[PDB]
Amino acid sequence: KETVYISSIALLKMLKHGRAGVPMEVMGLMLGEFVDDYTVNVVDVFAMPQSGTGVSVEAVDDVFQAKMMDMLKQTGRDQMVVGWYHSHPGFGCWLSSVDVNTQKSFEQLNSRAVAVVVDPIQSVKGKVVIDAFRLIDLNRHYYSLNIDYHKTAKETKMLMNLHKEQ
Amino acid sequence: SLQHEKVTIAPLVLLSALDHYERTQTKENKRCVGVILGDANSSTIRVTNSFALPFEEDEKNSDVWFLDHNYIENMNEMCKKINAKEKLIGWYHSGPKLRASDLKINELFKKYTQNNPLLLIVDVKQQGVGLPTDAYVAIEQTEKTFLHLPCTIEAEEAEEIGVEHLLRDVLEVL
Numbered sequence A: 001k002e003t004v005y006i007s008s009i010a011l012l013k014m015l016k017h018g019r020a021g022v023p024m025e026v027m028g029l030m031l032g033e034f035v036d037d038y039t040v041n042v043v044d045v046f047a048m049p050q051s052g053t054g055v056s057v058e059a060v061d062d063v064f065q066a067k068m069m070d071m072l073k074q075t076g077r078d079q080m081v082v083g084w085y086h087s088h089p090g091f092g093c094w095l096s097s098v099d100v101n102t103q104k105s106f107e108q109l110n111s112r113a114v115a116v117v118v119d120p121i122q123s124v125k126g127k128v129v130i131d132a133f134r135l136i137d138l139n140r141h142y143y144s145l146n147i148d149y150h151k152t153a154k155e156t157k158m159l160m161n162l163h164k165e166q
Numbered sequence B: 001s002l003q004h005e006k007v008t009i010a011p012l013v014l015l016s017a018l019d020h021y022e023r024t025q026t027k028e029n030k031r032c033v034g035v036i037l038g039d040a041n042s043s044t045i046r047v048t049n050s051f052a053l054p055f056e057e058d059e060k061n062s063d064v065w066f067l068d069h070n071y072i073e074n075m076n077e078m079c080k081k082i083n084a085k086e087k088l089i090g091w092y093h094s095g096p097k098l099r100a101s102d103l104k105i106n107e108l109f110k111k112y113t114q115n116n117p118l119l120l121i122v123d124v125k126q127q128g129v130g131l132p133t134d135a136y137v138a139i140e141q142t143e144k145t146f147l148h149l150p151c152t153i154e155a156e157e158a159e160e161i162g163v164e165h166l167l168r169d170v171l172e173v174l
């Protein structure tokens, strides 16, 4: 019943960033709007720098984040952090125990937070390998949300310039 | 001639310029302005990323405009921490056409680029016949003028996958 709507630039940035990071895991923050209890809009993302610690709460550089968030405000992007994304190069979309810990930190800041996971190796033409998770409130610890993509008419026309003849 | 021959632009840049224009609620006759990133070290300049800039200009006077120099330096420094391969190679604006102040604005970006800066106009209104992009580098002729360079839209595999995924429902219909 829950759905994460991912925008065009958000999806392209996450695929781009994941591929650029290979063979390492990368991570960043997702920006957007909690529309209602069953709906999260992800309108944009930004990359966090690689950290020696690997992907965890420690990787979140609060000085980088604050600077990036302030500068995005100045150019018209003042959306809430609605969660985080990270890459799993070659090994699919799920949360490890450390990922669950990271997500728990995000959930404590905002209980609506979403964890997106993308696989830049297994993502191929015709197959984007991505999933979105939240923690559950013998039970399993987390579950998967539907993902959909939102694009404007202007964005649709813009995307069609790739292979414009076709 | 040793001049750049052409320019390729990633779909992300087109969508980023449009998102910038929209999110700032830019209203005609005004334009949005930002930085482009990529690689300009060959005869093909590859434009692969971008970021928005705070920018203001005087309607009553083409000679009056302001760009935030500190914003350029501070954002670029964060961009470098994410991916040093994507260099600062020029600037963009939403046009749809070259404006009187552009050669002077271009002289500012010249202080930030290693290459002769590329100006990318992205026609976010998309009224043009062909590509919503026009590319220029400044050259001498004895005065400065913009040289028009041919553009194509091209994507690395990640983005190609992404774009195809985004246009899926449209493709089915058509």
Ligand SMILES: [Zn+2]
Binding pocket: A055, A086, A087, A088, A094, A095, A096, A099
């Ligand atoms: Zn993980």
